[PDB]
Amino acid sequence: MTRWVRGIFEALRPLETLPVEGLIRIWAHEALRLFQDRLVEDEERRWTDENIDTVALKHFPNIDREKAMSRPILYSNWLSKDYIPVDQEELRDYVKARLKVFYEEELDVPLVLFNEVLDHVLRIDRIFRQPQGHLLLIGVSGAGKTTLSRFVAWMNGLSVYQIKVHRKYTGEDFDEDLRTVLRRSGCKNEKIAFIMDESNVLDSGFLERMNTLLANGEVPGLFEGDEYATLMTQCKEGAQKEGLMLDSHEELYKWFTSQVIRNLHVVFTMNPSSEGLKDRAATSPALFNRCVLNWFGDWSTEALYQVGKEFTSKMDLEKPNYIVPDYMPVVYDKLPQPPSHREAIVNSCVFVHQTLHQANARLAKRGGRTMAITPRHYLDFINHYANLFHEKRSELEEQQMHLNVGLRKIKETVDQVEELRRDAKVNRSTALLKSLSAERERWEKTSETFKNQMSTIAGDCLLSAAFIAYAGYFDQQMRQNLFTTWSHHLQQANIQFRTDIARTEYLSNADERLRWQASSLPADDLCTENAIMLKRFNRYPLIIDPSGQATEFIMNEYKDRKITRTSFLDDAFRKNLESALRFGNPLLVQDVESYDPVLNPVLNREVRRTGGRVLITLGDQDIDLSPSFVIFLSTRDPTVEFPPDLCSRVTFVNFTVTRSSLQSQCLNEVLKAERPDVDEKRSDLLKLQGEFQLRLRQLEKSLLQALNEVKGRILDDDTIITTLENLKREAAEVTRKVEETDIVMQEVETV
Amino acid sequence: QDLKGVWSELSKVWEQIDQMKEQPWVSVQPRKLRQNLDALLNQLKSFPARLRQYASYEFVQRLLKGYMKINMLVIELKSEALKDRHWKQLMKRLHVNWVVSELTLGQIWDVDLQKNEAIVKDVLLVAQGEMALEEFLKQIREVWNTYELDLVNYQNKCRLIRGWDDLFNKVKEHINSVSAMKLSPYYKVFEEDALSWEDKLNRIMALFDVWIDVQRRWVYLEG
Ligand SMILES: Nc1ncnc2c1ncn2[C@@H]1O[C@H](COP(=O)(O)OP(=O)(O)O)[C@@H](O)[C@H]1O
């Protein structure tokens, strides 16, 4: 209530003329910032929202509730001055401009400004623009806590200072860091927005000092001995700068303390955890007394949809022949009707994220082990989608260009043979023409197949990327269930894709699989999918396996790149990581349960790119990050839990066997060892998804290489036609496989 | 006429700007420079709109606006950062031949700082890492040259040493930091001195590792 009255008084001080509706507006805005801000779930927020208006209308009749309480209530002083309320769209434009500028100075990584972020920016700005305005942010990892804190601090001129935590981080190091930040904030009169995560808070020794600093404004005992003498020496100069000449030591220390309160805002970024939050209350009450707390958890459907639209702007996703389906599976209520192809794709992506939330909640209800799902997973998914789409479209386009070059060469060769005919041999020439014509119509059919593939590529890539980024911790049955759910959702949206897509072959080639099998990797569907995830990832993969087969697999795979093994328990770890940054060799990590927070800059991919240099801030030291660096985190206990911070920075790769992996392995073993014909036909069907076409493409490249030498010598018997009839027979074989795919698939299903 | 009047005002403004630019870079105070530039801008804005519509006035106004924009780069350049080697790198990359003693704000302002913002920022960050490393070294020098052993009476028999924990912790921290200093691209400067101090740290570490055990044994056997 006191903060309420103080806030209303502050918003009323610069104004001189204000109607009653404006006063009710300020009252409602302050109520929402004080009471609705701290709420956790949706129902309480709606309850508070409706009851503020109810109380306002009950206590103040005869007022216009529209202007008095409009739905987008929002106050800021950036536009004009005097804390005058601002419309949402003009504020959005201003924040976009300032965000582009921020992009130019620091943190070029794109940010998307949806309504939630637009509100949190003003809340953080209001808290910063206040003496002793300490702030606590509670939200799921990757919701944009640190990023918005840094953005607002930069916009207000606050310099962000965050300590670097690691293992064996003794209290003396934190004492030195506190001394440095206090000296910078008070002695030099430079404002600091002090930001901490929960990695460095887990230790209870630091919480006493932080509590004292939050409450008293200065922590006694941090400055003593010669350190206190240097503090006083610089404090005298600071007083000289402000023209506040003082000589007594205790008065100078009081001035330093006041400078600290005026110019130090501490931001505590924490993940949502009821038991941990209660423990923090038990060990430090000021975190809920001095620190005003702000909650924003998972992004709403609007936020996910807007992020998807913005991050899929480079992508084509434009089908002029996209027929709208009646009864669209819709997860965004504001989806345009009728939606375009890009709108449908982004809606499907949001559905993928929400159905993964549903699957995780259902698995938690079942009693199994769940991993927290964060918007960073959505960003990783959309990045995989963009990369896969670009790669697959590039491959299809280059194959089409190769086919066009081949067709032009064939036309030139046919014209040359016609000119030669213009001059037993004539029958051979006629047979050559017939074969060339037939293979030409075959390549026209190949062009038609390429057009079909370009039609299906968007859906195929979407499903593949969703599998890569999202799945990985669940067993084989849950992976297949998620894939079937996504496929059915897309089929309801008329997003064209292959009905029998094969994940392993759409995401790899024959040579890659043979290389994997050369190393220690069993020919298991779960193992092949895990190898796929270990190949294509953006966040560094965290491998869990009770047998340790994956560790040996990635050791053999990266042996040529002098991969090194190092555990977190070993004290040399840091040093080894240093070498991994200097040289660029991969570095496998074991024993992830005892996580070292020093890895956070590596996992967060905090790269500073300046002056032809790429730097990583390992603790307090900047290191040149080698371009070909990669780190794998490994463990051996499936029954382990991970913090949401770690869970949101890595892609999980589960090697554990369950009732569905072992079932598939045993069924495949029986099929191979008792029905070799059925296993052969199954492999024929499963490799038909490009591998036969790849062999045809390679042999056609060889044929073009042979045919390029066409002058007389190619007519040794007027028939080099043996190579082209070889091509014709493999083409007829794969064609017959294509027409008879349903019968073979049904027979394999029956067996 | 009005054209003659605006030409005269332009000549006066140009004379003021040239007189301000005659100040050598050493004695150019960024705060006073910004205040004087703001005063000149206010003087320019005091002209009538008819005189303001002239192209030359617009050119000089936008030049002063660019100078105000690059005043931040001027502040960053005029510090303990550039020294003379970073200035040498800037001269080499910008292909300009100035004199350090004769350096003036006019020479730097002639070169487009706004166009060369990336180059200037890279040089500034290199200098940032450089004084970071240099001040870390100087801290090592001042903490080790002024450090004294904690001698204590021992039963009026002799003077022994305490403080093994603090001294060993300091040695370990310093040796770890010096060893890690071999990383980073900034390591290429002042390498030999860093190796010399590494050798000194190793020598003291070994000597006092032996010394603590010798002291313990001698106390025990004396008892
Ligand atoms: N509004 C947004 N639009 C797009 N990307 C965002 C937005 N907010 C956050 N992100 C991305 O999500 C990540 C946020 O991580 P962060 O919230 O800093 O983690 P933590 O809260 O654990 O510090 C950033 O890498 C950023 O790129």
Q: What is the DSSP letter of A158?
A: P
Pairing of the two strands A564-567 and A587-590: parallel
Pairing of the two strands A159-161 and A541-544: unpaired
CA dihedral A734, A737, A739, A741 (to 10 degrees): -140
Q: Is A7 annotated as a binding residue?
A: no
- CB-count exposure of residue B58 (10 Å: 0-12, 13-18, 19+): exposed
Three-class secondary structure assignment of A553-564: HHHHHCCCCCCE
Residue of A750, A746, A751, A741 whose CA lies nearest to A498: A741
Identify the residue whose tokens are 């970073």.
Answer: B86
Q: What is the spatial distance between Cα A548 and Cα A557, in angstroms, rounded to a whole number?
A: 15
- Output the furthest CA–CA distance in chain A (Å, rounded): 118
Q: Answer whether B180 sits within 8 Å of A622, measured CB to CB.
A: no
- CB-count exposure of residue B171 (10 Å: 0-12, 13-18, 19+): middle
φ/ψ of residue A355, rounded to 5: -70, -25
The residues, ordered by sequence, that sit 6+ positions from A585 with a Cβ below 8 Å of its Cβ are A561, A562, A563, A564, A579, A629
At residue A360, the 3 state secondary structure works out as helix
Q: What is the spatial distance between Cα A604 and Cα A641, in angstroms, rounded to a whole number?
A: 20
Q: Which residues of A440-458 are buried (b: 16+ CB within 10 A; e: fewer)?
A: eeebeebeeebeebeeebb
Question: Among A147, A148, A195, which is best to mutate for testing ligand 1, by the most ligand atoms less than 8 A from CB?
Answer: A147
Closest residue to atom 21 of ligand 1, CA basis: A145
Q: What is the spatial distance between Cα B22 and Cα A520, in angstroms, rounded to a whole number?
A: 74
Q: What is the spatial distance between Cα A252 and Cα A268, in angstroms, rounded to a whole number?
A: 29
φ/ψ of residue A331, rounded to 5: -115, -15
Closest residue to atom 18 of ligand 1, CA basis: A146
CA distances from A614 to A288, A380, A617 (A): 40, 22, 10
List, in sequence order, every residue forming a beta bridge with A268; answer none if it has no partner.
Answer: A136, A196
Q: Answer whether B121 sits within 8 Å of A578, measured CB to CB.
A: no
Q: For A478-511, give the DSSP string.
A: HHHHHHHHHHHHHHHTT----TT--HHHHS--HH
User: What are the tokens at A581?
Assistant: 């940054």
CB B167 within 8 A of CB B208: yes
Q: What is the spatial distance between Cα A69 and Cα A24, in angstroms, rounded to a whole number?
A: 7
Q: What is the spatial distance between Cα A554 and Cα A537, in angstroms, rounded to a whole number?
A: 14
Cis, bond preceding A338 (omega within 30 deg of 0): yes
Rg (chain B; Cα; Å): 29
At residue A468, the 3 state secondary structure works out as helix
φ/ψ of residue B152, rounded to 5: -140, 145
CB A141 within 8 A of CB A298: no
Q: What is the spatial distance between Cα B31 and Cα B23, in angstroms, rounded to a whole number?
A: 14
CB B103 within 8 A of CB B24: yes
B168: closest CA of chain A, how far (Å):
15
Identify the residue whose tokens are 């159905």.
Answer: A355
- CB-count exposure of residue A502 (10 Å: 0-12, 13-18, 19+): middle
The residues, ordered by sequence, that sit 6+ positions from A420 with a Cβ below 8 Å of its Cβ are A429, A715
Phi-psi map region of A142: left, alpha, beta (phi>0 left; psi -120 to 50 alpha):
left
Residue of A238, A266, A271 whose CA lies nearest to A254: A238
CA dihedral A623, A629, A635, A636 (to 10 degrees): -150
Distance between Cα A485 and ligand 1 center (Å): 28
Q: What is the spatial distance between Cα A378 and Cα A648, in angstroms, rounded to a whole number?
A: 10
Side chain identity at residue A65, one-letter code = R
Pairing of the two strands A587-590 and B158-162: unpaired
CA distances from B163 to A232, A293, A589, B143, B150 (A): 27, 45, 38, 15, 6
Pairing of the two strands A613-618 and A621-624: antiparallel
Q: What is the spatial distance between Cα A195 and Cα A207, in angstroms, rounded to a whole number?
A: 14
- Output the furthest CA–CA distance in chain B (Å, rounded): 107
Q: What is the spatial distance between Cα B43 and Cα B57, in angstroms, rounded to a whole number?
A: 12
CB A658 within 8 A of CB A613: no
Long-range contacts, stretch A736-739, CB < 8 angstroms, 24+ apart: A737/A684, A737/A688, A737/A692, A738/A688
Q: What is the spatial distance between Cα A243 and Cα A257, in angstroms, rounded to a whole number?
A: 17
> Which strand ranges, in their side-by-side order, compose the sheet holding A159-161?
A159-161, A192-196, A265-270, A135-138, A292-295
Q: Which residues of A721-744 are buried (b: 16+ CB within 10 A; e: fewer)?
A: beebeebeeebeebeebeeeeeeb
B125 interfaces chain A, CB cutoff of 8 Å = yes
Three-class secondary structure assignment of A84-149: CECCHHHHHHHHHHHHHHHHHHCCCCCCCCCHHHHHHHHHHHHHHCCCCCCEEEECCCCCCHHHHH
Residue of B177, B173, B161, B183 whose CA lies nearest to B205: B173
CB B113 within 8 A of CB B90: no
Side chain identity at residue A312, one-letter code = T
Q: What is the spatial distance between Cα A232 and Cα A183, in angstroms, rounded to a whole number?
A: 10
CB A407 within 8 A of CB A399: no
Q: What is the spatial distance between Cα A58 and Cα A49, in angstroms, rounded to a whole number?
A: 15
Q: What is the spatial distance between Cα A289 and Cα A181, in angstroms, rounded to a whole number?
A: 23
Q: What is the spatial distance between Cα B160 and Cα B150, in angstroms, rounded to a whole number?
A: 8
Q: Answer whether A621 sits within 8 Å of B185, measured CB to CB.
A: no
User: What are the tokens at A625?
Assistant: 């990050």
At residue B185, the 3 state secondary structure works out as helix
List, in sequence order, every residue forming a beta bridge with A651; answer none if it has no partner.
Answer: A541
A702 interfaces chain B, CB cutoff of 8 Å = no
**A579 to chain B: closest CA residue:** B183
Q: For A163-205, give the DSSP string.
A: ----TT--HHHHHHHHHHHHIIIIIS---EEEEE-STTTSSSH
User: What are the tokens at A620?
Assistant: 């307090």
User: What are the tokens at A432?
Assistant: 């050559």
Distance between Cα A307 and ligand 1 center (Å): 11
Query: Would the CB of A143 count as within 6 Å of ligand 1?
Result: yes
Q: Which of A581, A610, A621 sits opposite B122 (nearest CB)?
A: A610
CB B51 within 8 A of CB B6: yes
The residues, ordered by sequence, that sit 6+ positions from A75 with a Cβ below 8 Å of its Cβ are A11, A26, A29, A83, A84, A85, A86, A122, A126
- CB-count exposure of residue A402 (10 Å: 0-12, 13-18, 19+): middle
B122 interfaces chain A, CB cutoff of 8 Å = yes
Give the method used: cryo-EM
B64 interfaces chain A, CB cutoff of 8 Å = no
CA dihedral A84, A89, A92, A94 (to 10 degrees): -60
Query: Would the CB of A340 count as within 6 Å of ligand 1?
Result: no
- CB-count exposure of residue B147 (10 Å: 0-12, 13-18, 19+): exposed
Rg (chain A; Cα; Å): 33
Identify the residue whose tokens are 């003036």.
Answer: B104
List, in sequence order, every residue forming a beta bridge with A622; answer none if it has no partner.
Answer: A617
Q: Which of A578, A611, A622 sits opposite B122 (nearest CB)?
A: A611
Q: What is the spatial distance between Cα A409 and Cα A725, in angstroms, rounded to a whole number?
A: 18
φ/ψ of residue A119, rounded to 5: -75, -45
Residue of A209, A285, A218 whose CA lies nearest to A256: A218
User: What are the tokens at A575?
Assistant: 């040093």
CB A568 within 8 A of CB A591: yes
User: What are the tokens at B46?
Assistant: 């005091």
List, in sequence order, every residue forming a beta bridge with B9; answer none if it has no partner.
Answer: none
Distance between Cα A144 and ligand 1 center (Å): 4
Resolution of this entry, Å: 3.5
CB A253 within 8 A of CB A235: yes
Three-class secondary structure assignment of B121-172: HHHHHHHHHHHHHHHHHHHHHHHHHCCCCEEEEECCCEEEEECHHHHHHHHH
- CB-count exposure of residue B192 (10 Å: 0-12, 13-18, 19+): exposed
Interface test with A, best of B184, B186, B187 (most A CBs within 10 A): B184
A622 interfaces chain B, CB cutoff of 8 Å = yes
- CB-count exposure of residue A398 (10 Å: 0-12, 13-18, 19+): exposed
